[PDB]
Curated annotation (Swiss-Prot), chains A, B:
Record protein name field: Erythronolide synthase EryA3
Residue span of region Thioesterase: 46-248
Remarks, miscellaneous: Type I modular polyketide synthases (PKSs) catalyze the step-wise condensation of simple carboxylic acid derivatives. Organizationally, type I PKSs are arranged into modules, wherein each module is comprised of a set of catalytic activities that is responsible for a single elongation of the polyketide chain and the appropriate reductive processing of the beta-keto functionality. A minimal elongation module contains an acyl transferase (AT) domain, an acyl-carrier protein (ACP) domain, and a ketosynthase (KS) domain.
Active site: 117, 230
Sites where the protein binds substrate: 51, 118, 144
Oligomeric form and interacting partners: Homodimer. Erythronolide synthase is composed of EryAI, EryAII and EryAIII multimodular (2 modules) polypeptides each coding for a functional synthase subunit which participates in 2 of the six FAS-like elongation steps required for formation of the polyketide. Module 1, 2, 3, 4, 5, and 6 participating in biosynthesis steps 1, 2, 3, 4, 5, and 6, respectively.
Cited function: Involved in the biosynthesis of antibiotic erythromycin via the biosynthesis of its aglycone precursor, 6-deoxyerythronolide B (6-dEB).
Lineage: Bacteria, Bacillati, Actinomycetota, Actinomycetes, Pseudonocardiales
Length: 251, 251
């Protein structure tokens, strides 16, 4: 609770964000999904770019590596992080726009909407929009990073938020950061039958002896622990995360 | 008057500035002046940088070359427009620091403070401080560009200010912009018996038929006209403005 100067810096970046060009459902805006990989998997893994200062399609890069040859991977971007891109005037708009890109660039053929966490809410919002529109996803996948302890997880978060008030980003992204943050933060998710998978890829299976244990995704869901440390070839548990998503989609 | 969004954008930019490292009088902060050119003149021309989004010693490059071979020309920087520079906590802070620099390196040897309207207030601020410390300048030189009439000039400003909301500077400069705007904005320049030379260099020697004629610099002061349309070789309006400052001083 020490860094409340983060809330302020964010509240301000958001303010600046309102001067940028916004877009809603009205105006003919639209965007394209990015092809990360292909495989025979009957289910396409549509990934949502978190809203972190960094973020963007590039984040699901390693996951696409693991899925190449296993399933079709395509990422959704968050409009406004790249030069001259508009900012959604509402959670309502952005989910709608993205929603469009999917029904369009997917036609039939099932898909799963998934995100890293920095994109979990957007991922879930998109998921909702699809469902209301009539083209629900097979499911939602939340690839939770961060640690298991309530603190340490809360810390780590502010921790890296400061690293962007510390060789630094740019205007475009810092505004979007303040924008989407304003959005997801104010948005309230509701139930949606959508089966869900929560992958806990955080460090240390369980939280330190200081007993914390953070809150978990409310709404029915299944879970799989996937740490990051052991004995075959210490590098990418991305493939571990990947295979899990698949075996999940096939029971 | 429509553009009141600027009043806001600045505030926001200002609030952001507060997150930067500042400096008041106490902390032994300091800065150095820049030599721009020199000559035999018994009076040194110490020019202040404007507080515009651009601004910096560089804006005084023409007037320098115009005095090369005539009089020494040193420039005072506004702390904080360049990377890592702290921002003045108050108008008083920046003056003292600059004042120090001036007295520290000038000793005796007369001098004038010269602003560019964008730096008019800062110049006069620095001139007040300097006079208050026993080292008064020989006089002040407020150049000032912009149209002659109230409006037009009011447009020229508000219209270029927006040119920095359209090709865009950096956070350091835009923050620094709102920071100083916040400062000079609440600064109340009291009088001073200082000899002042106003150099109406703006285009339109007189305001367009449609009434205008802007409020001039209060306080005592001499005047000169040096528009933006002459008879010689179009480019260095500086050689003109320059030679006037010099003649002003010689009687």
């Amino acid at each position: 609770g020490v860094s409340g100067r983060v809330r302020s810096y964010l509240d301000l970046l958001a303010g600046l964000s309102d001067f940028r060009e916004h877009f809603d459902g009205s105006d003919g805006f639209s965007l394209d999904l990015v092809d990360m990989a292909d495989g025979p998997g009957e289910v396409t893994v549509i990934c949502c770019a978190g809203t972190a200062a960094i973020s963007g399609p590039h984040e699901f890069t390693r996951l696409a590596g693991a899925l190449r040859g296993i399933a079709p991977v395509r990422a959704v971007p968050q409009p406004g992080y790249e030069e001259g891109e508009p900012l959604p005037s509402s959670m309502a708009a952005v989910a709608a726009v993205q929603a469009d890109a999917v029904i369009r660039t997917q036609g039939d053929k099932p898909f799963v909407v998934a995100g890293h966490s920095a994109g979990a809410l957007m991922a879930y919002a998109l998921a909702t929009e699809l469902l209301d529109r009539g083209h629900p996803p097979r499911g939602v996948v939340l690839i939770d990073v961060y640690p298991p302890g309530h603190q340490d997880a809360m810390n780590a978060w502010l921790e890296e938020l400061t690293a962007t008030l510390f060789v630094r980003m740019d205007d475009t992204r810092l505004t979007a950061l303040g924008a989407y943050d304003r959005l997801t933060g104010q948005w309230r998710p509701r139930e949606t039958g959508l089966p869900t998978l929560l992958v806990s890829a955080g460090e240390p299976m369980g939280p330190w002896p200081d007993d914390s244990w953070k809150p978990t995704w409310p709404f029915e869901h299944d879970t799989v622990a996937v740490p990051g440390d052991h004995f075959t070839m210490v590098q990418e548990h991305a493939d571990a995360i990947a295979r899990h998503i698949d075996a999940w989609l096939g029971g």
